[PDB]
Design an enzyme around this catalytic site. Structure first.
Site, PDB file in Angstrom:
ATOM      1  N   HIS A  42       0.815  -1.226   0.000  1.00 32.70           N
ATOM      2  CA  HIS A  42       0.000   0.000   0.000  1.00 32.70           C
ATOM      3  C   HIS A  42       0.843   1.267   0.000  1.00 32.70           C
ATOM      4  O   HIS A  42       0.381   2.316  -0.413  1.00 32.70           O
ATOM      5  CB  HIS A  42      -1.013   0.041   1.150  1.00 32.70           C
ATOM      6  CG  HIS A  42      -0.440   0.444   2.472  1.00 32.70           C
ATOM      7  ND1 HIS A  42      -0.032  -0.472   3.421  1.00 32.70           N
ATOM      8  CD2 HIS A  42      -0.241   1.670   3.015  1.00 32.70           C
ATOM      9  CE1 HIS A  42       0.387   0.176   4.492  1.00 32.70           C
ATOM     10  NE2 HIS A  42       0.272   1.477   4.270  1.00 32.70           N
ATOM     11  N   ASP A  88      -0.508  -7.386   1.733  1.00 37.28           N
ATOM     12  CA  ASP A  88       0.127  -6.057   1.767  1.00 37.28           C
ATOM     13  C   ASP A  88       1.639  -6.201   1.891  1.00 37.28           C
ATOM     14  O   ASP A  88       2.225  -6.012   2.958  1.00 37.28           O
ATOM     15  CB  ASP A  88      -0.467  -5.252   2.918  1.00 37.28           C
ATOM     16  CG  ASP A  88      -0.084  -3.777   2.869  1.00 37.28           C
ATOM     17  OD1 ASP A  88       0.446  -3.330   1.818  1.00 37.28           O
ATOM     18  OD2 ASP A  88      -0.325  -3.076   3.882  1.00 37.28           O
ATOM     19  N   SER A 185       4.095   2.538   8.651  1.00 41.80           N
ATOM     20  CA  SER A 185       3.631   1.604   7.622  1.00 41.80           C
ATOM     21  C   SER A 185       4.761   1.136   6.700  1.00 41.80           C
ATOM     22  O   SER A 185       5.542   1.960   6.223  1.00 41.80           O
ATOM     23  CB  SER A 185       2.564   2.315   6.774  1.00 41.80           C
ATOM     24  OG  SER A 185       1.820   3.208   7.615  1.00 41.80           O
ATOM     25  N   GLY A 186       4.818  -0.175   6.430  1.00 39.18           N
ATOM     26  CA  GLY A 186       5.836  -0.725   5.541  1.00 39.18           C
ATOM     27  C   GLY A 186       7.100  -1.133   6.271  1.00 39.18           C
ATOM     28  O   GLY A 186       7.918  -1.901   5.742  1.00 39.18           O
TER      29      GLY A 186
END
Ligand SMILES: NS(=O)(=O)N1C[C@H](C(=O)Nc2ccc(Cl)cc2)[C@@H](C(=O)Nc2ccc(-n3ccccc3=O)cc2F)C1
Ligand SMILES: [Ca+2]
Ligand code: NA
Lengths: 234, 50
Positions: A42, A88, A185-186
């Site tokens: 994402h 994801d 995130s990530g």
């Protein structure tokens, strides 16, 4: 990261930061080897063009060890969709190899079966990043880390507005005000076994940050170990 | 491998009702066949020291 504390020198060496054209960090990543970075699929939707910075611990000061790398190939899981946030995961092959050093080293990839039965059964994992320090608050200029307890999949499903798939796992606290947050995130979720840190998750999503009765949702790396290996062999 | 991880430092698997330890890339199984020995200065999963 909400709560938690700043990483010390050499404490979170596998952390990578994806930076946009404004040279602003917007997602994290995990160093897997000199040529590959693991991140969330994402994250690839946020900036048409981005680069990767390794070795940074303070985004407001340029310090020894920081280096910027351009991405050569983006390998996004073909089943990722924002409708469910399932699958994801993405792997980035860099144009030039990372030179490992103080504050720049890869996290280990575990064997699947052993990770499922031995790593995923540990009490806690460690998440880190430069994300918001409060829901909807400012991103941290310093690299932070946070110990987060694994959360039972069923308790998590009951707490969630959205479907938790087998490609995800939950971690964090029910009410204690500590959690990963947007911007992290990530980034990496690692689990220590004896004296080695293994990558076990990718910071993926959450309803708010540190909300009472809500947990952090991570992509379950063990479900993608073969996909990662295939992706890493060009 | 159910308890004590077969005394393995990293990976443990049961090969023929017997414990078999192994290690991540960048490591080599030690003589005792349980410990893992790094091959370089920056092996995966280790925090860095000056
Ligand atoms: N501006 S903010 O308030 O600070 N920010 C904090 C939230 C976050 O990312 N927290 C956070 C918390 C903990 C951790 Cl581990 C990672 C992120 C983020 C959000 O709402 N993300 C989010 C929520 C839901 C889904 N999702 C899941 C399933 C299906 C479809 C679907 O859209 C996808 C998402 F991106 C908004
Ligand atoms: Ca810096
Ligand atoms: Na919570």
């Amino acid at each position: 990261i909400v709560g938690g504390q700043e990483c010390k020198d050499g404490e979170c060496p596998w952390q990578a930061l994806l930076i946009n054209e404004e040279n602003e960090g917007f997602c994290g990543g995990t160093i897997l080897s000199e040529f590959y970075i693991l991140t969330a699929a994402h994250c690839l939707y946020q900036a048409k063009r981005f680069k990767v910075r390794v070795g940074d611990r303070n985004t407001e000061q340029e310090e020894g060890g920081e280096a910027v790398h351009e991405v050569e190939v983006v390998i996004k899981h073909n089943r990722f969709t924002k409708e469910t946030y399932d699958f994801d995961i993405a792997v980035l092959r860099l144009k030039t190899p990372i030179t490992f050093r103080m504050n720049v080293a890869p996290a280990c990839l575990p064997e699947r079966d052993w990770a499922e039965s031995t790593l995923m059964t540990q009490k806690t994992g460690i998440v880190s990043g430069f994300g918001r320090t409060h829901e909807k608050g400012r991103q941290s200029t310093r690299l932070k880390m946070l110990e987060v307890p694994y959360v039972d999949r069923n308790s998590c499903k009951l707490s969630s507005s959205f479907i938790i798939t087998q490609n995800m796992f939950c971690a964090g606290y029910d009410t204690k005000q500590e959690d990963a947050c947007q911007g992290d995130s990530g980034g990496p979720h690692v689990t220590r076994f004896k004296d080695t840190y293994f990558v076990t998750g990718i910071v993926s999503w959450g309803e708010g940050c540190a909300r009472k009765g809500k947990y952090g949702i991570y992509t379950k790396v063990t479900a993608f170990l073969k996909w990662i290996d295939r992706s890493m062999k060009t | 491998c159910s308890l004590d991880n077969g005394d393995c430092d990293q990976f443990c698997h049961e090969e023929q009702n017997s414990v078999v330890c192994s290690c991540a890339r960048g490591y080599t199984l030690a003589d005792n066949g349980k410990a893992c020995i790094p091959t370089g200065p920056y092996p995966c999963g280790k925090q860095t020291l000056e």
